[PDB]
């Protein structure tokens, strides 16, 4: 019953091309991480 | 009535149930229900042991 039903459809798709719909919610935009920059200060002090 | 039949025609599930006549599809569905019931019985028997 379906062999003909579906096979002809594939054969002749491009005479009536159609497309399905899907949910495509947006992605969460985030900041691009810049190269990590630490604080360097060569601290000194009197030792207890 | 034609609209009701057209509505139901699309709602058939898979190949073995593709009797395009809905009323004829009912009994095939119920045959599946019986088959499923037997499988369930065997599986629960296995689970007990």
């Amino acid at each position: 019953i379906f062999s003909q039903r579906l096979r002809q459809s594939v054969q002749h798709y491009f005479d009536n091309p159609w497309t399905l719909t899907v949910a495509n919610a947006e992605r969460l935009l985030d900041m691009r991480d810049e190269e990590l920059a630490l604080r360097n200060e060569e601290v000194t002090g009197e030792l207890p | 009535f034609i609209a009701v039949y057209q509505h139901l025609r699309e709602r058939i599930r898979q190949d073995i149930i593709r009797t395009d006549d809905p009323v004829d599809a009912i009994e095939q569905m119920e045959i599946e229900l019986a088959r499923l019931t037997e499988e369930l019985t065997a599986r629960e028997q296995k689970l007990a042991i």
Binding site: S9, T19, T21, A23 | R9, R11, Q14
Partner: protein, 212 residues
Amino acid sequence: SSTHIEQFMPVKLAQALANSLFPELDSQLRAGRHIGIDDLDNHAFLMDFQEQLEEFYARYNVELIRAPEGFFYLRPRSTTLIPRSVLSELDMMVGKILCYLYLSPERLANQGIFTSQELYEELISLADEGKLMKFVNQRSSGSDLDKQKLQEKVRTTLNRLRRLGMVYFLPNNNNKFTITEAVFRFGADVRSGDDPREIQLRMIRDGEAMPV
């Protein structure tokens, strides 16, 4: 009385939203994933609270829909609060071929495990090879280089359909995969034996499928 859940929400709906499976499933459903019988946890959860989830998502102007084959998915309306997108025609070729594979009893002996090569061979068997080649590259005339390009595009689309939940790769082998019942939505244009154009118009009116 006041300060009582029932004032603002049905108890069953609040009970569903408080479940530990909800966040994963909501994130995936909004992403377009289809839910079949195999992932029991999610499918059973959907069955338990179906009406509550349908009424909830209705607030966004989207229908939570259940196909007769038993798989759930989201279909946005025209006034949808959530964006909507359409698949490519190559995606359709591979999808219909995956469906035909699922039905085929001659290959039932594979026990569900298929290889990309077999899929490619079936596709080329039914479609017009060279004229379908027109979409891969405008200058293709059967060259093996262009054949490899077609194979790689097929591989990529198959991966994308994996993300949609239409197919599962094996745990250790990425060259072999197993089908799921969600593929049957590719047959929506032929499952009823009637005039194709009226079927097409009904689908487009229902929001299932757009033209190109």
